[PDB]
């Protein structure tokens, strides 16, 4: 029993980061077989930032300008390239701890584990999910970029995910491993508004059957709903949609329980209109939507990689 | 910017889990040098659980009824000894995995971070506080004993929790490396109540002013309060006694912030009396007690 916020054992992602500076700016790169992947940002000084053009700045460095360091031991890097906004190093030595792994684009929705890291050295690591206007909610720091989000299927790493900045709301931005940004965003320094955000309701109605099988069952009432007239309901509240999809995807939740997709929807319906009234589910006063059905199920089942 | 409940990286920890099975019951151990530790529960079937003589259930195990699995090579149990309520298991093989490392009792307040296990297979991580009551609010199934707590310091594996039991109010008890449970706790199955609780007082400052440094402020008033007179109101809602040592270890972070504790301790007592009136502070409709003064400075 018990329900935590719990990310993926960081191990095989340790091994996997470097330090990578390049002029005064100095941040973490990934280094998988021979090529170290790091935000193109690193070969811009402050001032450039402003209005880069990275290809005019790309073609003024050279392999020495970028210094790698694996530890105590320094890597030669005998290549670069540009491919979107990420930098491609090409390094002598082939990482012997590079595990199985992906490069995947993961859907606003979906979550992953940020191992946060600072001059090539893990410091900490914690869940994120990528908010439905491309952001994500993290805790970064000068140093942190090309820190990454990954989940584990047991022996592979599917890194989706490699930061870069940090928009008004103190909300970050950052690309997928190909450097293609998730969202409107760009590598520059100009203002930048991330749209309006909304409420990732599947994830709710996960979160609520995590209550349940935890013993928190005072929310649940004996009326059900149509997807369509809960869909009234959750466009007032600022949340997402509904689907077939969603509804479907809840199924195995849905059977552990004994309740219907439908009869939790009218149980989220009541509670968005009246409010919690200064009760709390699973230890938290407002919904949580940072929990898919797989991070619920995952928890209530104790799957291991 | 961004505060956010972090667990530290797990790779040093992962290296040491392995399986342990005696009889029916299968558990995690840690394996640090040539030694196994693990629950010494992983002895008892279903029926001695319920009153276990652990004297009399060990003596009737041998080394051979103890299969240790550290992926899929078997370790040879050459020893077994029980150290208050941990089996430390001898075997024929160091561990080259073993990381620099300590065993510490933490105290009430203090925080860790949990890495999950099941076949002796690392699951998640997360960061968990001792409670005043010392119990812990994680998330544990069946086979999960065996997992452990620790702090990390630069190279340095500090362990200081091996988990052991779930109480009756949903809550987990366990013990030190040393196999010393925190608070009252047997490891019996029998109803055992956790004490009252209280909250962390020093740890919900230091989360004010983690959304302080963060620019979370609408909290901050232009009042300030003595020691006296913020624990008359502290007692009232169950919060722990301020110490002159809270006011101390605030240090670092009042200094970063420019702001008095006595000030950020008038905020706290707005904040206990008049409530939140539906606003949050970091994202959080209730007041936080699970982030250290140390746990904020390392985010900040
Ligand atoms: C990477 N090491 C940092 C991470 C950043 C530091 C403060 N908080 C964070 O998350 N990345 C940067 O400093 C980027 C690099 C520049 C650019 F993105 F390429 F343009 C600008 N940086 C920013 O994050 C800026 N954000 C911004 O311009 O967003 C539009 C700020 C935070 C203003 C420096
Ligand atoms: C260890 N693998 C489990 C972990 C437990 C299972 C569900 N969630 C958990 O945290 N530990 C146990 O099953 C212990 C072993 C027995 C004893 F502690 F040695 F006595 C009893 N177990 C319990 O946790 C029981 N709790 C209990 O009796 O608390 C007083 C329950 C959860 C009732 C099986």
Redesign the pocket.
């Known amino acids: 029993s018990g329900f935590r916020k719990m990310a993926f054992p960081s191990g095989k992602v340790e091994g996997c980061m470097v330090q990578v500076t390049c002029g005064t700016t100095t941040?973490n790169g990934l280094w998988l077989d021979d090529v170290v992947y790091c935000?193109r940002?690193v070969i811009?000084t402050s001032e450039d930032?402003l209005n880069?053009n990275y290809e005019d700045l790309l073609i003024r460095k050279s392999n020495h300008n970028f210094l790698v360091q694996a530890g105590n031991v320094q890597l030669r890097v005998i290549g670069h390239s540009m491919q979107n906004c990420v930098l491609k190093l090409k390094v002598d030595t082939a990482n012997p701890k590079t595990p199985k792994y992906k490069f995947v684009r993961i859907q606003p929705g979906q979550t992953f584990s940020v191992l946060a890291c600072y001059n090539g050295s893990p410091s900490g690591v914690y869940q994120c999910a990528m908010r439905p206007n491309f952001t994500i909610k993290?805790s970064?720091?000068?140093?942190?970029?090309?820190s990454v989000g990954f989940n584990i299927d047991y022996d592979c790493v599917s890194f989706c995910y490699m930061?870069?900045?940090?928009?008004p709301t103190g909300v970050?931005?950052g690309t997928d491993l190909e450097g293609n940004f998730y969202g409107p965003?760009?590598?520059?320094?100009?203002?930048?508004a991330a749209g309006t955000d909304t409420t990732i309701t599947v994830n709710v109605l996960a979160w609520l059957y995590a209550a349940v099988i935890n013993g928190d069952r005072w929310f649940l009432n004996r009326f059900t709903t149509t997807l369509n007239d809960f869909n009234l309901v959750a466009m007032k509240y600022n949340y997402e949609p509904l689907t077939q999809d969603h509804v479907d995807i809840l199924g195995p939740l849905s059977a552990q329980t004994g309740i219907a997709v439908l009869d939790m929807c009218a149980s989220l319906k009541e509670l968005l209109q009246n409010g919690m009234n200064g009760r709390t589910i699973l230890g938290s006063a407002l919904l949580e939507d940072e929990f898919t059905p797989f991070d619920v199920v995952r928890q209530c089942s104790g799957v291991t990689f």
């Open positions: 941040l935000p940002h811009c930032m880069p993290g970064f720091l000068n140093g942190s970029c090309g930061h870069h900045m940090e928009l970050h931005a965003f760009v590598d520059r320094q100009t203002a930048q």
